[PDB]
Amino acid sequence: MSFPPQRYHYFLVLDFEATCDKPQIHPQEIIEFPILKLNGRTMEIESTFHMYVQPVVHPQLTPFCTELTGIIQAMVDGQPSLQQVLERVDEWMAKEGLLDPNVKSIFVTCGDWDLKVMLPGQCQYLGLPVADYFKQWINLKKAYSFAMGCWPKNGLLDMNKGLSLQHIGRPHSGIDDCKNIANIMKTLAYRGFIFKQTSK
Ligand SMILES: Nc1ccn([C@@H]2O[C@H](COP(=O)(O)O)[C@@H](O)[C@H]2O)c(=O)n1
Ligand SMILES: [Mg+2]
């Protein structure tokens, strides 16, 4: 059954980028906040939220961070901070119609880190409540492991390799990582996979 009925009207693909260094910076702060809204049945991209975020605790991006993500200082200077971006997300959700209880959506991330560690950790640091729609998600690696029967070693790169897909854009670009997640999801749906919440 190619592209079977799914349990959600929409999938929200998210992949943060955060301040970093070697050794790792502390604390890390979200600097890129992308969301791709996918049609629940076809996995086609229908809307995009994308904002760079101004870090505050460590406001200057390290050379490693800019080299890893491609995000330069001018992309985060003058941006809203996480608190305001989270308010922009809520407005975006409202306009998309995703705040209707009868519209079922779920976030999809590559790994658990984004919504199990990064966002709650920074929100706790800032004293900000985490919106309830951030508290359930699908770990694509776990989903892939049920669809393909195997554990990918290196995230999106190895999942594209397993599915014979060309990598979209630049690795460690948040928006480009989201497009790869969406492309992997589309192929898994073509193979007949029905996505399920994995977060506990
Ligand atoms: N080698 C790496 C890979 C990721 N990271 C951190 O983890 C974040 C999320 O990783 P991805 O770019 O793989 O999504 C990065 O924005 C960066 O802060 C890192 O600091 N060193
Ligand atoms: Mg990323």
Swiss-Prot record:
Protein keywords: Exonuclease, Hydrolase, Magnesium, Metal-binding, Nuclease
Binding site for AMP: 17, 172
Residue ranges annotated for the Exonuclease domain, each copy included: 11-185
Key word Secreted present: no
GO MF annotation: an example: RNA binding
Binding annotation for Mg(2+) 1: 15, 17, 177
Known EC number: 3.1.-.-
UniProt-annotated catalytic positions: 17, 172
Protein name in UniProt: ERI1 exoribonuclease 3
Organism: Homo sapiens
Whole-protein coverage range: 137 to 335 of 337
